[PDB]
From Swiss-Prot, chains A, B, C, D:
Residues 52-59 are annotated as: Catalytic site for iron oxidation. One of its GO terms (cellular component) is ferritin complex. GO terms for biological process: intracellular iron ion homeostasis; iron ion transport. Pfam families: Ferritin (PF00210). In horse spleen the light chain is the major chain. InterPro entries: Ferritin, Ferritin-like, Ferritin-like_diiron, Ferritin-like_SF, Ferritin_CS, Ferritin_DPS_dom. Belongs to the ferritin family. Oligomer of 24 subunits. There are two types of subunits: L (light) chain and H (heavy) chain. The major chain can be light or heavy, depending on the species and tissue type. The functional molecule forms a roughly spherical shell with a diameter of 12 nm and contains a central cavity into which the insoluble mineral iron core is deposited. Interacts with NCOA4. This is Ferritin light chain. Keywords: Acetylation, Cytoplasm, Cytoplasmic vesicle, Iron, Iron storage, Lysosome, Metal-binding. Its main location: cytoplasm. It is found in: Cytoplasmic vesicle, Autophagosome; Cytoplasm; Autolysosome.
Length: 170, 170, 170, 170
């Protein structure tokens, strides 16, 4: 590339892996969203919560693909693996799986930042810090807030607590 | 009729039967609505839910009567049978009876579409597809959503769950 | 399902295959869009053309998933295969690959409509006719218009014609 | 200085060298801009492109001089060397010289960030990341986009392609 400057092949390969993780995450949140749209599940606020996260993960992947082109790297796309479950259980089981997914996206972002620091790439480190690291921490905190509230609700009787969390929080 | 073209007597008879089914349905939803307006029942959102459905079924019957006149067919009215119950029980029993009623209206719409396809009536098939088939599927989905939410609520204790569904959903 | 009525397992399986085809198509248009965003390609209007098509294919897949839930069918997601190429050549080669992709989506829509007609599913046939069949025909016509204009431009000298099509048409 | 804290003399000397590079760059873009304003060159959009870059490089140098005063360092000005050419050739030769100039400003910014990291100056590293590193990457990408478009245009016949790039892109 005629524009590539201080952009190693190891960072370029790791950004392509992170694009695949964000696209896989968006595919999982899509599956989560239409599960809660089922007539025998019927939790509309839970559906809208996961459908918003599917758009955010897809826009995070497009933000990385735009950065890859701005630095002169080449995007390589892989197969998107299907989500790990077909049925997602309750709102508690779904939010638990969503926070495991966000923590693994956060850990992959931290391994890219540590790779960009060892390779001495200050533009990559500022790009992750401006758009990706702070939004992951905020989302993991909000999901942990939801998990604490769901677990204090579904202690007594699960169906009443699951309905009230969807109505009054989401 | 001077305007009748490709409109068989079997379709005309079946449209008159479907007008009677939609008027009977509107009479049932009226009885459902004023049951939940009783002082010893007192579920105002359930009352307003069924009173809106009574207007929709009546406007569906008038839409079929307008189509019968546009095609040159003749409207024949029968006796409207009284609704199957005088008292409708709980919100769960009422929504269960409402989805049985909507599924039988949907099945009668599908038998009219299959009759219009065998008689090769493309205007009748487009009329049912534009105004009747899609609204039945949406209403049956919404009622199934309500039934799933009511049944997850009235598991613990019925009176608290019945009040909360009326307050927070309807 | 408590809401499923006149919705066969063969139509439900074929809708799940069509969701996968529309998601694969959206993945291909994403790869097409960021290829033309490369600094050594640098055709901004071609990039924006394919990025709009990636959103349309994704919204077409979500429209089918919403219909699958409204009819009481169950969404099953598969692996999204990666796009067939990593590099897409010129605007002529890209638009040729885009019209092959749209014609195969159109053919899969026609096989679903013929399956819904043999199974006598008039709601499925109206759903494809209202949202999917007419938009495919319009998009295939617009792509064929672009292919005729690109081929009359890149006859003389390819680079001048490729720049002028991006500037003045897209 | 009474305000100087964690600001080494090596960073202060390197910021003064970077002020001179940004002022030299602004002088080169001024010479580029008024070359394309000549009556025997007469490329008005190319003139306006380089005159905007002359203001951006001058405002980048004033932003560094403001930071030098905020940290308690002392600005030392050197002679501004005249630009390397008097005549700049075509738009292709000018954009090639402009991207060599921007890449050397980018490399000097990366050597200052690596010096601020070895000296453990986190305020200097955030200042370069917020205002300087991201704008250099965006400008180098835009110039590489222009170079790809100019080279695909001036392949056939140079004068027609040079006029069309100025009219339709700049």
């Amino acid at each position: 590339s005629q524009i590539r400057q201080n952009y190693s092949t190891e960072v370029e390969a790791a950004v392509n892996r992170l694009v695949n993780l964000y696209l896989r995450a968006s595919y999982t949140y899509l599956s989560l969203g239409f599960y809660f749209d089922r007539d025998d599940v019927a939790l509309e606020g839970v559906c809208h919560f996961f459908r918003e996260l599917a758009e955010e993960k897809r826009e995070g992947a497009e933000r990385l693909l735009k950065m890859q082109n701005q630095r002169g790297g080449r995007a390589l796309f892989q197969d998107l693996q299907k989500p790990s479950q077909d049925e997602w259980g309750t709102t508690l089981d779904a939010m638990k799986a969503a926070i495991v997914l966000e923590k693994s996206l956060n850990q992959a972002l931290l391994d890219l930042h540590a790779l960009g620091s060892a390779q001495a790439d200050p533009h990559l480190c500022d790009f992750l810090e401006s758009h990706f690291l702070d939004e992951e921490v905020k989302l993991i905190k909000k999901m942990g807030d939801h998990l604490t509230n769901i677990q204090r609700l579904v202690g007594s009787q699960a169906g009443l607590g699951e309905y009230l969390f969807e109505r009054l929080t989401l």
